[PDB]
Amino acid sequence: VEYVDAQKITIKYDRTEEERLVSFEEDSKTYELVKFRKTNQGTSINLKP
Amino acid sequence: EYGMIRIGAEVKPGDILIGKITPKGESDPTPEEKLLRAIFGDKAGDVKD
């Protein structure tokens, strides 16, 4: 992982050299955590790292 | 400005969340109404909650 915060988690994925040659994207990837999202029933989805 | 409650407010019962004005039903402007608006003013502007 690279950087962790209540809103996001960015992590460097290990990719093979061939996969790096074929893929157009950087090895790093950022995930945005769901923060207080309403469900169909009124309950909340709160995710923390 | 857009009649929308601020982020962080406490929604006590009966408070306005999204204020709105709907154009009220002006009938034919009878002369009596015209004079009353001319002298008193447009206090009853054509907008309903």
Partner: protein, 49 residues
Amino acid sequence: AGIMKLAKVYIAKKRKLKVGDKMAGRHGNKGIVARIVRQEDMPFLEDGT
């Protein structure tokens, strides 16, 4: 179509456990919280807990 503007307000309710709330175990045992009893009025073991 037919609607100019959409205004959405999201309101969060912190609901603590109170009398009348429904609780249940994993074995078909369900109940309603009939009384919130103080610490000193609860049954306690030889260690005082």
